[PDB]
Amino acid sequence: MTKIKSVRTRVWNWTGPTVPPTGNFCTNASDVLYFHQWLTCEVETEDGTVGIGNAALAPSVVKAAIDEWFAPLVIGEDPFDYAYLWEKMYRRSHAWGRKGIGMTAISAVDLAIWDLMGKLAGKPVFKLLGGRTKEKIPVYYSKLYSGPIDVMQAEAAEAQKNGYSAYKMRFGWGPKDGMDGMRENLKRVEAVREVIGYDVDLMLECYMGWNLDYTKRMLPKLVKYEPRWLEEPVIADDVEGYRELNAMNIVPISGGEHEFSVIGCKDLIEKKAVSVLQYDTNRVGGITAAQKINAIAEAFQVPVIPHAGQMHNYHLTMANANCMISEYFPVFDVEVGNELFYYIFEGDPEAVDGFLDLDDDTPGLGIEITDKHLKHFQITE
Amino acid sequence: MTKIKSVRTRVWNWTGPTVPPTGNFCTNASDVLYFHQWLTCEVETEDGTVGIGNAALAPSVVKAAIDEWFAPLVIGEDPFDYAYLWEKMYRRSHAWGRKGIGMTAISAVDLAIWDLMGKLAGKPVFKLLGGRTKEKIPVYYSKLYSGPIDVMQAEAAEAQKNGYSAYKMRFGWGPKDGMDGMRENLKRVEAVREVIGYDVDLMLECYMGWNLDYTKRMLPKLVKYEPRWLEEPVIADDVEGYRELNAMNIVPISGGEHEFSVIGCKDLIEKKAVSVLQYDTNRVGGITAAQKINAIAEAFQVPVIPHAGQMHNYHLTMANANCMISEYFPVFDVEVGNELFYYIFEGDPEAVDGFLDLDDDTPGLGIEITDKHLKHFQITE
Amino acid sequence: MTKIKSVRTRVWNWTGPTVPPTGNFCTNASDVLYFHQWLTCEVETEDGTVGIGNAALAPSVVKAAIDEWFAPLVIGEDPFDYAYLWEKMYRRSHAWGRKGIGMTAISAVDLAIWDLMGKLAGKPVFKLLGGRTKEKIPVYYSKLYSGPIDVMQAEAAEAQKNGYSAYKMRFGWGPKDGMDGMRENLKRVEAVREVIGYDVDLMLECYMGWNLDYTKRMLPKLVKYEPRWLEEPVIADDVEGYRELNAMNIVPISGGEHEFSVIGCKDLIEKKAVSVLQYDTNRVGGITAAQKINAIAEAFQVPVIPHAGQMHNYHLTMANANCMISEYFPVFDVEVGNELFYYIFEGDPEAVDGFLDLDDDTPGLGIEITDKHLKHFQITE
Amino acid sequence: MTKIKSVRTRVWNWTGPTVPPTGNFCTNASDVLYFHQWLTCEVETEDGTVGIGNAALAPSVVKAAIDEWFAPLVIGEDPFDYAYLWEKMYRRSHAWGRKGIGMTAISAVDLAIWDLMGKLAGKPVFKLLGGRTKEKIPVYYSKLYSGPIDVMQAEAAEAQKNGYSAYKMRFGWGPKDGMDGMRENLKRVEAVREVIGYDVDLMLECYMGWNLDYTKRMLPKLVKYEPRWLEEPVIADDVEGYRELNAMNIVPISGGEHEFSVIGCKDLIEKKAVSVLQYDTNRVGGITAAQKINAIAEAFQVPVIPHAGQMHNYHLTMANANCMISEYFPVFDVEVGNELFYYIFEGDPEAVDGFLDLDDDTPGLGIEITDKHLKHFQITE
After folding, report:
1. I need a surface site. Which of A310, B96, B361, D12 has the fewest CB within 10 A?
2. E strand or H helix at C7, and its extent?
3. C-alpha pair distances (Å), D218 with each of B196, B201, D241
């Protein structure tokens, strides 16, 4: 048994070319009001093995938490005491850490620790989690930001070429735009359906942009388009609103990507706040947490479909039969900031004809930090 | 109308003399496992007026959030747009901020902004909040850390001299110590009652040290001592456990000091998770938040008794009739870290014969950052 | 600090020209059976400052309550002890005052006291409440009393010129008129939609004219017209009926304008009696009360849209992000009695292109009692 | 059939000798803060018959409501259309009348109307209500205001002479007095039990003086004294608090004397807010209302024991088997104001050996307004 030696946390700033977003083009929690980054966490053991974790939420602030509070707790420990290390981090920072910065920092560390275990054991992380429950992993195409109709329609037609069985689009108007914005929203769902048809699934996303009232009034209007779910209609604090909308059984409500810890997600599950749970492993508390969340969701038969198409999620999805598909979009330009991971890591699979797959023999998470794009980054430590 | 010019956030490290705690001497969320600081936030307007905020949770990490994310949002704004500024901070950081680091940073800023408004208006903050609902504010004596019986008994006898009508003590044993620890806990409640008697109230505190199971078994055993409440028996994430214990109606359950945002506390209230709500204004989201929380709690007739005896809480308590007493302990040595505020600020009232009071004429929060103890501090910016 | 000196309460009787209403033209709580006035309350401090409050419910009887019970309680007090004064009035009259006459009298007094504070502090009331959360305040056009189809249609077309994004109309038939009245009601919703279209919102009002049974049967029939809410289908005492209708999720149920006190409204909110809360500040208990109600509603994410387009409501709406629009109608003749305020006060903004706004610099409520129409009034004291 | 001709409403002010109350001597809704009158309403028909109603809440303000709004509605009507007249008053004033002043005014009028019907029909009101369900009516002794122990004990011993099977006392300390006040309260319950013993019932009254929190903590402490109920622990608005305390099943909670209308009381009943309902007929809406309330309470098997020992309650109690006892105290001096009725009316029975009775042959309510005490009254109209 080798022990954790060091924790190297870095904040990556995109200095490369960018495409400024447009009007809309996605509703947001800030709508009611009038540098793109990523974080890497590399954990190395005395024997030189290195595990890679990451986070995207408030990277500099998360790095300061990892450096000051979490790194010192894991140094000199066996990675295979992961549950104990998770608990140690969770309880030592509980006062301020149980959601937000703390739990995100914990995720990045825990992710690295799992990469370690797989590398130390010569096994892909998914094997340690239960192994192969699926031949390959279907994905749904997740982009279709709101914009002019012809623009959105052309995007749908292009995406269609790679044979997805499901698609997700974003809304552009909310409560501030009243009924006219409702009509604009509906026009765009309509336009996307015209291209992709009704032999595929269409999911809708509000990104915390709406509210309980607007959502209750909009819901009946969405039925004709047969959406598979409506994601984050309300702000993440408004769990009672989630339950209320979900219990209406008009369109399945989804969320969780802004929820933290095992208990946090347990409460969304038990209270029937979501029909689909979409935590991001690099937020929710790491694989240690997500593994436990997956057991709960499975037992309640609430589908888990993690936010984000990355390895830190794909291995979890592979190992659990109640995780049937993953979120995906291919490597395009930097426009929103969530694409940054494709320029920092090598190893994230590319979907082909609606599927991607994991290698039975690649140890750990199967990612490495890459050189290819150092030119477009300013990296701080 | 003058506008916010700058935000000056500093982390204070106690380098002065200290008294190392002992066995026990308070249960803790970390019990299941096998420098003292404070933060100041000074907001200054174009006309030189300065408002003082503060926080105690993870100060360096909170300062990094204030500096990077929150300060830039309030600069160039009217302090009297406080609700808008609160909302701006809350929604812009919602993804990662709604509890923990984010909401704590927001609290420190919001507190400064309220100090400003009172100074700008030549009114004590409590007047802006509704004014004087009480002749003076009764306090309960909040120390009595767990230790040898004679030690605890001597502390009680000393405290007794200042005529408190209520006292709170801490437990020293939890789930790990089984029945023997239960007996040790009960001996100490017993010992304190022997000194203070049954013509006063005794509150008990676990500081997240216990759990749902242990607490259910302990509750019947506490009845004979007539405790007024049992504070934070479980970890802050375990809200369902809170509800379950509270609904037993054996001893009133209290908590909230590790809860964040208006909605966070609304849920503790509506779900009957606590019989007494004890948020700390320098965590929960500032006075803007605490004012709204107080309205909810009042309407539900759940007493609000903020965690901590400081001005950032006392003004709130003065202005609302459902806030009947405050937490207090006088200026003693530095032993735990929570005493640090008495060496950084002047203006926090001292209880005399169980009461303290606010000045009808002192503008703002009535505190200032002091020189007296610069010798015992290393202050970083 | 200056103290309250006097309270001057007057009842205004319209002696000017009037337009007698017609068949229908609005359902009413009295349908099951077979002088227009307003009240002013002027509170003056020792230094000559005067704050203006008002009420419209049973003015002579409300004046007698203010004069005998409430005025004497506030005289010689600091306006900035408003919360204490509110509590004093509320508890001293609780036995008979907690709703109806008492709470209405309290509202008028409390409103004056808030006008004072803003004037004393040289700030618009909304700044003291949290400040500017909105660029301007959208309004919905609130008239469209029931009548002949061409009449209603012409009103809609005229209103349309001022560019409202939402409209409210009144029903003319209820339970007594059975299915034929249902058809008459539906014809009129139909007729209004023909003019205004489906790119705007249409709200419907029953003014306590219907009942639980009739409403349950009517609800499915209203769906095709996509109404945004149905206001006061039942009498204000029938809160269980409200909950039952609201939980059907057929059309959002609204109400509250006949509800009183913070707790009164808290119960409508917690019990899910309304989807939209519409208290009138000059009934519900004044700004002191409405401010606390707004915090509760916001936390539950129940939109607050006060009954009546006046300053006593607009400032509240400006200061809270969960208050997104206000009720409005422009100055027309005296026909119903609710128009009387436009002839008594100057300062109530006029909506232009669907919006109105508040002045960042006008202290207090920004209203004054006017001379312009003394000719059409007989004023008693 | 003769028709209502006039309504004569008068306010009686006691100018006679009085005994100023003392420290305590009863908790009150105003405790949290730091002329005695009665109303008569005489309704006369075209044939000279006169029915007598009354009220005690805010008499001048109630008279102004009766005079302006309610009298005009009943003039020229048959008294035997009482239900229609009740409905007419209730709905015409609903906006402002459904509780408080309005419903109290309605009570006084409705009471007169019932006196009329009995006189017109040559029957005691109780016969019209269902007749004699009891041989006589047991009463409980209702005084024992809080004071020095020997004083309270001497009162109990005196009362004991008239052979009551039940007694009610008032508490003198509340939330402001903390644990010491709890001990003072308990001493007095103890002292009263020492005199009266445990072969009788003891009821306790707080008169809205306590709160939900204090009451939950006090309840276990009251068990040893075997109280039959605890009356109005919280303010009348706090119905959720009532339900919560009542559901604890520690001591039966009672209330309702500050509740109004049939629906108001229905909600206390259905929601299990009280174990005993104690409306006062001269508040709750008159006999028309109380008759309907009695049917509801009976069906739910919630005992009805009206507040106040007067004819307006006794007839109701006689006619319903679920009304087993009445409140009583004999004619003593004027000290509190609630004794005033004994100096205004003749006909209210006097309890002897714990019982009083109604005359099978006396028409109407069996009361008349008396001359005996005109010397001690200034009567306004």
Report:
1. B361
2. strand C4-14
3. 19, 12, 14
